[PDB]
């Protein structure tokens, strides 16, 4: 018996990407082709279906720490505001690209809202995170 | 495994120091065999404390240089590891032998001081310090504006220095620093 | 870097002049001797004085001292 | 009855003298009093250029102002605190008391 924490986290994002490739009931937005992920990026992501990469990755930030709302999931998805010729600083993600993940994951009962705000993780979601964690535990033998 | 300490996976024993003179100041075979290059620190508290550093850590430290790389030891622990792959996957010998045989042949036996400038034979530690500098110089130089990567250049220098080919940058400097020193003695 | 100032050495050479009998080679006693036989406002200065007391006590037991 | 002496001093030893008198006074009436809690000290920081003008070597002051906060939880009626805390004031400490 294993959980996501006993599993390598860096490969685990793809195990839950494939879980939401197989479901296909997320309703991905339409700007997803034309968008820049954060105000501090230069190019569009390499992966054609980057939404499934992070919609996976969002739940396993909501798993480890419960109640990370819009503002929290723009910090953990923060990088470098590379300001060209001026010094580079910290920049957050985008409110649109992170909320439409949190709205897409609320439908299929994996995330859930709580009093004093913030998306927690529903009793059901902890299963479909750990059942694929057992698959990676079998893949590494 | 408390019987032998596998530097990542590499043999500490069966590493022969050929030069009797550098034998103390090149110190990894006994009581210095640690699994990473990366130790805590405390090899710049006193004068000859630098001598009792595991020599791959010295080689790892002398890499993180030319500004942008300063204090990126995690990044260059990996460089020297991926270079030891290249040495064994060519030479067939343990790269710690190929390191030690480079360090013996990289550091110059004399340097020209200024008391025309005078000739003087250098300290054994002066060789070790100038060995690790001169082969981390050529490794950095050749890899610059190049398709060839660091560890390919870091493991070209470590192999070519032990060979004594005068293809390694480290050997040209050693052979010419003594060429200058022989001229003005 | 560690040279005793005249303030430490004068306090030392007067304590060993007066309270010689209580003193000896052991630091940690003649550290605590100074708590009874002086009013010293610093802990760091107490140890400096008591330290050079022990250094003079190993000298006095061997032969005569200048001061 | 959840009475709470918020002791906030600019000094250190005047706060020790106050909070020691708020224990040595409380014990003989036989009321259970929690030990004086230490809240993490808040240091103010104003770095000024020393110079009235801007000419010389660019030297700076480092004006600290350490502030210390304590609390003392009391299991006592609302009247007993008015009797003890009025006795033996000293101007360093700001002796504030919360009801609930």
């Amino acid at each position: 018996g294993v959980t996501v924490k006993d599993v390598n986290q860096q490969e685990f994002v793809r195990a839950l990407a494939a879980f939401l490739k197989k479901s296909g009931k997320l309703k991905v937005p339409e700007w997803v082709d034309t968008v820049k992920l954060a105000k501090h990026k230069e190019l569009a992501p390499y992966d054609e279906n980057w939404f499934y990469t992070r919609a996976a990755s969002t739940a396993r930030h909501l798993y480890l720490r419960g109640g990370a709302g819009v503002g929290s999931m723009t910090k953990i998805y923060g990088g470098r505001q590379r300001n060209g010729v001026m010094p580079s600083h910290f920049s957050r993600g985008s409110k649109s690209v992170a909320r439409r993940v949190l709205q897409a994951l609320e439908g299929l009962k994996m995330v859930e809202k709580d009093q004093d705000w913030g998306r927690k993780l529903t009793p059901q979601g902890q299963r479909d995170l750990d059942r694929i964690a057992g698959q990676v535990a079998a893949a590494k033998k | 495994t408390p019987d032998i300490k596998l530097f990542g996976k590499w043999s500490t024993d069966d590493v022969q120091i050929n030069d009797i003179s550098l034998q103390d100041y090149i110190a990894v075979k006994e009581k210095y065999a640690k699994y990473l290059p990366h130790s805590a620190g405390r090899y710049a508290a006193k004068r000859f404390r630098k001598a009792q550093c595991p020599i791959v850590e010295r080689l790892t430290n002398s890499m993180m240089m030319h500004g942008r790389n300063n204090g990126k030891k995690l990044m260059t622990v990996r460089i020297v590891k991926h270079a030891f792959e290249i040495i064994h996957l060519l030479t067939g010998e343990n790269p710690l032998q190929v390191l030690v045989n480079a360090i013996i042949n990289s550091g110059p036996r004399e340097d020209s001081t200024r008391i025309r400038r005078q000739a003087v034979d250098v300290s054994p530690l002066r060789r070790v310090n100038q060995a690790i500098w001169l082969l981390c110089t050529g490794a950095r130089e050749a890899a610059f504006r190049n398709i060839k990567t660091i560890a390919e250049c870091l493991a070209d220098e470590l192999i070519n220095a032990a060979k004594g080919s005068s293809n390694s940058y480290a050997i040209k400097k050693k052979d010419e620093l003594e060429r200058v020193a022989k001229s003005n003695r | 870097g560690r040279v005793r100032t005249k303030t430490v050495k004068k306090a030392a050479r007067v304590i060993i002049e007066k309270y010689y009998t209580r003193l000896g080679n052991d630091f940690h006693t003649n550290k605590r001797v100074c708590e009874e036989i002086a009013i010293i406002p610093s802990k760091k200065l107490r140890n400096k004085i008591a330290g050079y007391v022990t250094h003079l006590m190993k000298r006095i037991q061997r032969g005569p001292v200048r001061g | 009855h959840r009475i709470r002496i918020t002791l906030t001093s600019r000094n250190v030893k005047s706060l020790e003298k106050v909070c020691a008198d708020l224990i040595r006074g409380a014990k003989e009436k036989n009321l259970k009093v929690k030990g004086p809690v230490r809240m993490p000290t808040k240091t103010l920081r104003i770095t000024t250029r020393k110079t009235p003008c801007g000419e010389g070597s660019k030297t700076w002051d480092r004006f600290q102002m350490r502030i210390h906060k304590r609390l003392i939880d009391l299991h006592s009626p609302s009247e007993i605190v008015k009797q003890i805390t009025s006795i033996s004031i000293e101007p360093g400490v700001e002796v504030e008391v919360t009801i609930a």
Partner: protein, 75 residues
Amino acid sequence: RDKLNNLVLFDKATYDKLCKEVPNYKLITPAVVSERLKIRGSLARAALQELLSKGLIKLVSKHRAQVIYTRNTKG
């Protein structure tokens, strides 16, 4: 002055060289294969995912900064 113009896709002779002479070496790194055979560094990485699934190379170390392959073992 001197402008090295490498191959983005394989000349017929160069894939005939790459599918013959590359496993005959003692190292297969995507920077030596690029430098020697006059091909591209990215292309020399793409060549060795295909020759991985042929079973004619040997995956010793793989990192983002540096992947190393070698000849197939003697036995």
